[PDB]
Amino acid sequence: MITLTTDFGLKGPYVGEMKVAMLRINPNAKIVDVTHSVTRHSILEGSFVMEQVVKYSPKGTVHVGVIDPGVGTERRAIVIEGDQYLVVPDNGLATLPLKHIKVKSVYEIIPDKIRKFTGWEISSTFHGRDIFGPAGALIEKGIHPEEFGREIPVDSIVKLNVEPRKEGDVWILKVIYIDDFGNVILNLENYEKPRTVELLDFNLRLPYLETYGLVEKGEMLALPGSHDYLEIAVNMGSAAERLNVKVGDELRVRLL
Amino acid sequence: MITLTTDFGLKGPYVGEMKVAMLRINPNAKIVDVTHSVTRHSILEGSFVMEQVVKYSPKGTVHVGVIDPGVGTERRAIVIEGDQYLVVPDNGLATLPLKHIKVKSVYEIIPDKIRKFTGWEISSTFHGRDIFGPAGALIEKGIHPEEFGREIPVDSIVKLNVEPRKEGDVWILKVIYIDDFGNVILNLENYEKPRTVELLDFNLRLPYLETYGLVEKGEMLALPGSHDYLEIAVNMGSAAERLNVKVGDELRVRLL
Amino acid sequence: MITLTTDFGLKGPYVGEMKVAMLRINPNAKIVDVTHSVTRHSILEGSFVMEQVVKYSPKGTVHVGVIDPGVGTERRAIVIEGDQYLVVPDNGLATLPLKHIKVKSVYEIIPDKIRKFTGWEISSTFHGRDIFGPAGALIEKGIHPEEFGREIPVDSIVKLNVEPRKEGDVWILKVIYIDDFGNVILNLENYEKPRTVELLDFNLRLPYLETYGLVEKGEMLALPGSHDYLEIAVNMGSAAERLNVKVGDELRVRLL
Amino acid sequence: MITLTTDFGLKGPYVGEMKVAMLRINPNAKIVDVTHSVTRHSILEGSFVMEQVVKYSPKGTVHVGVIDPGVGTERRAIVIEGDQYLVVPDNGLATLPLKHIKVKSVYEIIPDKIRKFTGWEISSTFHGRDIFGPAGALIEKGIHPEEFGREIPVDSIVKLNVEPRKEGDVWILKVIYIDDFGNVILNLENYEKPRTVELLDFNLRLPYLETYGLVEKGEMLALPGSHDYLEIAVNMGSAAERLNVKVGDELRVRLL
Amino acid sequence: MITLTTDFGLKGPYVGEMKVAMLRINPNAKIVDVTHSVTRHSILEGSFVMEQVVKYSPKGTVHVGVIDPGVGTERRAIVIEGDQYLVVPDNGLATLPLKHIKVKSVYEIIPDKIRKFTGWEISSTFHGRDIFGPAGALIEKGIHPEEFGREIPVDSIVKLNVEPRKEGDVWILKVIYIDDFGNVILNLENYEKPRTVELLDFNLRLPYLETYGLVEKGEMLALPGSHDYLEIAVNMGSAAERLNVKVGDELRVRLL
Amino acid sequence: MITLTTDFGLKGPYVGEMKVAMLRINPNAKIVDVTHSVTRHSILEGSFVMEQVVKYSPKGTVHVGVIDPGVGTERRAIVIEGDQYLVVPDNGLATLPLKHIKVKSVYEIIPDKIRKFTGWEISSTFHGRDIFGPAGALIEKGIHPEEFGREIPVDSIVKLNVEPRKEGDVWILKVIYIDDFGNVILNLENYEKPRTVELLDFNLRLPYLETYGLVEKGEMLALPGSHDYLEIAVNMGSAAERLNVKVGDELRVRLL
Ligand SMILES: Nc1ncnc2c1ncn2[C@@H]1O[C@H](CO)[C@@H](O)[C@H]1O
Ligand SMILES: Nc1ncnc2c1ncn2[C@@H]1O[C@H](CO)[C@@H](O)[C@H]1O
Ligand SMILES: Nc1ncnc2c1ncn2[C@@H]1O[C@H](CO)[C@@H](O)[C@H]1O
Ligand SMILES: Nc1ncnc2c1ncn2[C@@H]1O[C@H](CO)[C@@H](O)[C@H]1O
Ligand SMILES: Nc1ncnc2c1ncn2[C@@H]1O[C@H](CO)[C@@H](O)[C@H]1O
Ligand SMILES: Nc1ncnc2c1ncn2[C@@H]1O[C@H](CO)[C@@H](O)[C@H]1O
Secondary structure, three states, rough: OEEEEOOOOOOOOOOHHHHHHHHHHHHOOOEEEEEOOOOOHHHHHHHHHHHHHHOOOOOOOOEEEEOOOHHHHOOEEEEEEEEEEEEEEOOOOOHHOOOOOOOOEEEOOOHHHHHHOOOOOOOOOOOOHHHHHHHHHHHHOOOOOHEEEOOOOHHOOOOOOOOOOEEEOOOEEEEEEOEEEEEEEEEOOOOOOOOOEEEEOOOEEEEEEHHHHHOOOOEEEEEEEOOOOOEEEEEEEEEHHHOOOOOOOEEEEEEE | OEEEEEOOOOOOOOOHHHHHHHHHHHHOOEEEEEEOOOOOHHHHHHHHHHHHHHHHHHOOOEEEOOOOOOOOOOEEEEEEOOOOEEEEOOOOOHHHHHHHEEEEEEEEOOHHHHHHHHOOOOOOOOOHHHHHHHHHHHOOOOOOOOEEEEOOOHHHHOOOOOOOOOOOOOEEEEEEHHHHHEEEEEEEEOOOOOOEEEEHHHEEEEEOOOOOOOOOOOEEEEOOOOOOOOEEOOEEEHHHHHHOOOOOOOOEEOOO | OEEEEOOOOOOOOOOHHHHHHHHHHOOOOOOEEEOOOOOOOOOHHHHHHHHHHHHHOOOOOOOEEEEEOOOOOOEEEEEEEEEOOEEEEEEOHHHHHHHOOOOEEEEEOHHHHHHHHOOOOOOOHHHHHHHHHHHHHHOOOHHHHHEEEEOOOHOOOOOOOOOOOEEOEEEEEEEEEEOOOOOOOEEEOOOOOOOOOEHHHHHEEEEEOOOOHHHOOOOOOOOOOOOOOEEEOOOOOOEEEEEEOOOOEEEEEOOO | EEEEEEEEOOOOOHHHHHHHHHHHHHOOOOOEEEEEOOOOOHHHHHHHHHHHHHHHHOOOOOEEOOOOOOOOOOOOEEEEOOOOEEEEEOOOOOOHHHHOEEEEEEEEEEEHHHHHHOOOOOOOOOOOHHHHHHHHHHHHOOOHHHHHEEEEOOOOOOOOOOOEEEEEEEEEEEEEOOOOOEEEEOOOOOOOOOEEEEEEHHOOOEEOOHHHHHHOOEEEEEEEEOOOOOOEEEEOOOHHHHHHHOOEEEEOOOOO | EEEEEOOOOOOOOOOOHHHHHHHHOOOOOOOOEEEEOOOOOOHHHHHHHHHHHHHHHOOOOEEHHHHHHHOOOOOOOEEEEEEEEEEEEOOOHHHHHHHHOOOOEEEEEEEHHHHHHHOOOOOOHHHHHHHHEEEEEEEEOOEEEOEEEEEEOOHHHHOOOOOEEEEEOOOEEEEEOOOOOOOOOOOOOOOOOOOOOOOOOOEEEEEEEEOOOOOOOOOHHHHHHHHOOOEEEEEEEOHHHHOOOOOOOOOEEEEE | EEEEEOOOOOOOOOOHHHHHHHHHHOOOEEEEEEEEOOOOOOOHHHHHHHHHHHHHHOOOOOOEEOOOOOOOOOOEEEEEOOOOOEEEEOOOOOEEEEEEOEEEEEEEOHHHHHHHHHOOOOOOOHHHHHHHHHHHHHHHOOHHHHHHHEEOOHHHHOOOOOOOEEEOOEEEEEEEEOOOOOEEEEEEEEEOOOEEEEEEEHHHEEEOOOOOHHHOOOEEEEEOOOOEEEEEEOEEEEEHHHHHHOOOOEEEEEEE
């Protein structure tokens, strides 16, 4: 199957257009919507979203990702062939997902070849419908990427900077994601299970417990989350609205 | 076919993870989204949504519902087997849907027996991806619930208070649901159709008509609705904003 | 394949019911969601959405559209048979889509004939679930529209006025759509590529470029768009935000 | 759903080619094999097979039948549009099936229009793969027959003579089919339940019972059958074996 | 999915009729043909065939088996609910398959209930199309057997005698199956790997090797087979035509 | 989509086992039967059948072919990757199909790596169910062959002699296939179309016409055929029985 991640929004024809276009090229493709509400142009959030889906997807799955603020410009459209596939703009969007994929090859999609398979013209502002979507549909049915692209160096693709630095014993982490519940996710993984977590920027000591219900309603806590990162949440409340933080912001955190 | 109802939200990887996880267990399950926008942790609301879908669903349909504020706590995860199936947390979510299901037996999902099918660790904060989703996928492909759970008494599961109260011929109804148009659904059903409905708390008299268009724009009415419950609405307006009521509120009502 | 376009909203059971009702009629129908977030009762907006999807859908595709403020009134429920199908309320919703369909026949759905196929009572406020959904599903599995309807004149159906007028060298263009990015779409097509677009009501002179990134972040511009309509946008910003416009407004535009 | 009935045989690539050709036109078509073992060029036998399948197929079903001894000659290739479809060579193959289809229109497939859809050259000896298969597939995904054909008179098509004649009290019945068990099927239907059936050509008086087991193993009998035609059988034996008959022979039968 | 095993034959409409009937009741059922060439009325061979398929089928699979010489008589039509399902005539056909199924319940299908789900009349000679097939299709979509049958004692079903006896050191086995290659299968399993195998009825000593190619072309051998029984084969020849044996025949075999 | 071609035969559990085994690995693989009636162990015949199917198959199609007399021996099991995929035993079966596949690489299936995917023991006499079928199902769902095999040189695989020989202007052609009608296919292709074809060995002169019907019933002709090879046939008769030739025989032929 093919998963879809974009920032197109839900109030319009964009998502539908991409889907029917994909079905034109592969009518029996099983298309799974991850989300289309990724913050406009937010490559980092889009990357986090895909990273999570990729972690639980069956090997052989095709992932189309489209947070393309640079659509129409000279940025490359690539295909990452490996354990699973990634069809995304060469803008760093593949960074997080790549952490969980055994890469075999990378290909730059060639617009002229892709239009050979689609039949319709390639717009300058909607590549998800004219390039990325079709490309995903082609791979799903067995077409090799070589057929519509040229290989490129694996290490020649834009990579985002998502790893945290540490000043002594203090962690300087960043908010890589915020869900609809207001739960805040921080770019810290593989750490040792703390007993407490202090958000030095707020002079708050937090209990580090397994789940929301372990603290009373309205109270804040830290948990190992469900995506292997450090999570900060308010039981039945919004941790984001408390600490009043955003994706991209940095926080000094000390793990006790 | 499997239906999905959650409070997960639309911008995140949550829904996508549960779907690929389900497909990873039953690669050709037909998954139908109901909604993922149920007000956060609102079991009553989630229960109303499931009730409606269950009423029109083909017999044999499997319904996965995840509004689970108590995720990872002592609360049980259950499977209800009958006319159709319900796979939800044991927190009352099944209350309304149960009204339309010929129940044969109920089972408690035993985590370890489930992990034997999935192959991956059960998180403490995302049972929709690690327990409920997989359980639904298994039932869908023919696996009996006994395979991953132990039978329990129907009467043992948690239930919500959903009965309307009547003081003489004044009804004390509860707002069980408000849709995107602001139409207010009150928990009154199977009543003699009135000519007028008066909302005693607002000193309003409303005509009881069959549809929105039967009154001028901006005018308020009461109708049979499409879900067998008494509906209050404003033709092309929002009864919820005009009456300023929220799910859970109680209204003194008299039918003339 | 069947497409869906409604103004039902995503926070509710409405979309779920229509779908399970459809799958009940034709259990193996492939249903593709276009959108259910169309502004309440906005027939024009719905019409634009459908037009775009129809242009890229394969021939044979069935399109169910439901933006029905007059549900339950005397307004007709029709089926437009052509190289693609449209199942919609006779309220002008089919106006734009018709521009890309060569119509063969038009039918008026007879409620009593449809009930013979569904088996359940038809409500007064939810025809999408009891009439339109079923109709689309029946056509999808091969049933001829005549079985549940009678032929009517192609030009007897409601039409919206979507044509832009020009006085002198000034275009009076209407905002037929606004997307989640705030990009504004005007009802002007088949025009000669301008160098600059002037929005007289704002004293704004905008550059006509190929894509968003061709200007600085925050700068406004005009583009050929990706839907064959003049598009007013703000690089990574909201054009509708600034111009403070909304679907339906008419702008005086000068093409230089 | 599309059904297939041919005389291609099972020891070859013929059936495989027609199928992959069809899936090439409509990759998600559900193809159901009826039989490909019809006696070579036996149009009558093919017609009986199709009749039976048509009687139980759901409305909307497309039936491709290919028993084509005159492939490549001037014989027409037609499409019979009704509450069910028939895609067959105009050689009388549709005779029996028509008895259960209310015909709406009949078309003559235009080779050049079909080639526009397939993309490959049309052979002279394998139209099932290059014309009929494609035609069925196109209709299945929603393309109207008119796109690749022109309407022709319903009664302008070849018909077989399948009516049984009666002289006095003696029926002259034809063997329209013989199954793998050797059970013989005569073209007599809508007759009053006899007590005994006499096969004059054999001086055999047979008992008319409900099923095989109602007589001794090895004994011959007559039954109402399961296809609404008089059936001559031998309990766990071959009736055609003994009577030494074959599809096409005419038996003089007396109904007592 | 549903598997199908019958003795209907391939030259006719029987198999097709059952399939379309099943799709009427469950149009998205995945139907897999095991075989339809089981020797007429041969319950033992039919049982062996099913036993093998059941061994490799996914849990939850539904198996419809129809070798029904007693069709129309008073023999019971049952459903065996367990690890997997068996929908077959109560004539011993379930014997072998039951060896690999964790049985939960057994049900006698009630003709009157089944016709409630089908809509068409139940013939006396074709229960595969009017009872067994529909029943299989119902279970595949989630309907419980209780819905169209009444439970009966697990041990009240006809069982075939398939186990071998042993006179001292000599085995008196029977031929339970013969494939198209002429390979002979004998009802002996779980035995200790012999070095030689003597067919005392022919005064032949046979090498007991892993596969056909281990002996020269035309030579006979014994192997553990691929179905866990003792197999007798002629490399690239017919072992059945040599020993000139049939299904059901007994052979005195001594394992050295 | 996956096609299947074998010499398994039609009456047995062999084909059914391979299909459920495949579905057990890839539950939603679309499996298309070509034939299972290839003359026992005839690699040449099996190769011809696959060639034809491959010619009309959509790019990306996976073709599983099992005619494997050397099953369980030293013979390798291979996967050929390219335009489409071939999964067959390394015994020459791929010879003809290879002519129509743009080969990218070839792999040898490593038994132990395959068992890691299936979960069950590999038999010594049924690799179609334990190796070839599973391998095809894996490729179909996106698994790269590298995952269960090691690359090998294209030129290393076994190949059949299939070239036609010419002695001056007499051709020495081979009967590469005979279908169910008795039409004889000779291994001659891309030749200047003749007016007459004389079979020197029978002192027969045959007209070269486009189809069967162009000669009287019972008469013999030569035609282009539908598979690009020279075909000899008898209008409504059997050229194979008239010439009394079998696959593999050689005929001295001259084109005038
Ligand atoms: N106004 C805009 N400015 C910049 N990018 C835009 C704008 N509107 C749409 N895009 C989109 O940005 C998305 C990635 O953020 C791409 O899918 C691209 O289509
Ligand atoms: N901050 C939170 N407090 C309580 N429950 C939560 C919180 N975030 C998510 N959940 C619940 O946990 C599950 C997965 O998000 C859902 O039941 C969801 O409603
Ligand atoms: N309050 C409302 N007023 C008018 N239309 C509504 C309202 N709520 C929903 N509708 C939508 O418009 C149709 C007619 O009212 C309904 O079936 C639904 O599609
Ligand atoms: N030898 C033959 N003579 C006549 N018909 C044949 C012959 N072989 C195949 N056919 C079948 O009849 C059609 C016309 O000959 C062919 O397309 C095929 O369907
Ligand atoms: N002539 C016959 N005698 C006995 N049984 C028959 C005969 N013809 C068909 N049957 C079939 O026997 C099959 C089982 O052997 C059943 O499917 C039943 O339909
Ligand atoms: N008796 C036999 N001798 C040689 N090969 C056989 C024999 N029986 C089956 N096979 C082959 O083994 C595989 C499974 O039957 C196929 O390749 C088949 O042709």
